[PDB]
C-alpha cells in the first residue's frame, strides 16, 4: 500500500464489475435477439448464479474494513473488543480455507 510495503490483503471472491457487465450484455442480447459465444453465455449464467454470494463476500470485506478502522480509531479500547476480533479472525481463517 501507499506508505506500507506489506501486502494489503484485499481478499475476496474472484469478481469485478466485468461479471455484471457480462450478465447485462447477456440479458440485452436475449431481449434483442442476437447470436453470441454460448459457452460465454453459460459462464455468464454461472456468474449470475454466484452473484449474490459475491455481493455477500464484498459486504463482508467492507465490514471487516470497517472493523479494522474502528480498531484503529479506538486503539484505547482495542483490547476490549478482543473477543470479537478473535471471532472475526477465526471466521476469516475458515473462509480463507
Amino acid at each position: 500500500v501507499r506508505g506500507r510495503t506489506g501486502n494489503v490483503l484485499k481478499l475476496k471472491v474472484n469478481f469485478l464489475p466485468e461479471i455484471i457487465t457480462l450478465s447485462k450484455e447477456v440479458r440485452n442480447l436475449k431481449w434483442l435477439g442476437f447470436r453470441v459465444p454460448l459457452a460465454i453465455v453459460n459462464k455468464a449464467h454461472q456468474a449470475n448464479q454466484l452473484y449474490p454470494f459475491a455481493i455477500s463476500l464484498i459486504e463482508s470485506v467492507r465490514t471487516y474494513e470497517r472493523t479494522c478502522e474502528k480498531v484503529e480509531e479506538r486503539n484505547t479500547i482495542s483490547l476490549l473488543v478482543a473477543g470479537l476480533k478473535k471471532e472475526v479472525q477465526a471466521l476469516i481463517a475458515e473462509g480463507i480455507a
Binding site: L79, V81, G83, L84, K86
Partner: protein
Amino acid sequence: DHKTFSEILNRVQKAVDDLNLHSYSNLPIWVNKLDMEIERILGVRLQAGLRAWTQVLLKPGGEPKIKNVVHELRITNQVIYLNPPIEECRYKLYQEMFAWKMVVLSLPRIQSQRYQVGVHYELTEEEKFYRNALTRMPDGPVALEESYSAVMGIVSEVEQYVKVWLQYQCLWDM
C-alpha cells in the same frame, strides 16, 4: 468535593456495570487499566489537596477550612494551665488534618469487582476505599511530609506562646 467525587465514581461504576453486561473481551484487563487510571487521577487530586490543606494551615485544588482551638485559663487551686490540654490541641489539629485528607482519600473504591464473584468481600484499603492512593500520591511523600511538618510547626508555635504566657505561675504560687 466528597459529593462530586462520589458522583463521578458512581457514574464510572454504572458505566462499568453496563460494559460488563456488554460481553466485551478482556474485561479483567480493562478493569485493571481503568483502576490504574483512576488511581493516577486520584493521586494527582490527593497531592493537590494535601498541598492546599498545608497552605490553609499556613478549580481542582480544593480549599478546606479549620476549627477553633482549646485556649483558656483557670486558677482552680492556683494552677494556670491552659484548657484543654496542649496535647488536646495537637490531637484536634491532627484529627482535622486526617479528616480533610480522608475526605478525598476515602472515596469509594473502583467497583470493577462487581463483575467478579466467588469469594467474600475483600474490603481492604483499595477494596473498600481507595486505600493505596495515599501512598500513590504522584508528588511523592513530600506532600504528606509537608503536612506533618506544618502540624509540628503549628504545635511548636502554640507551645511556645503558651509557655511564654504561662511563665507566671510563680506569681500566684509565691
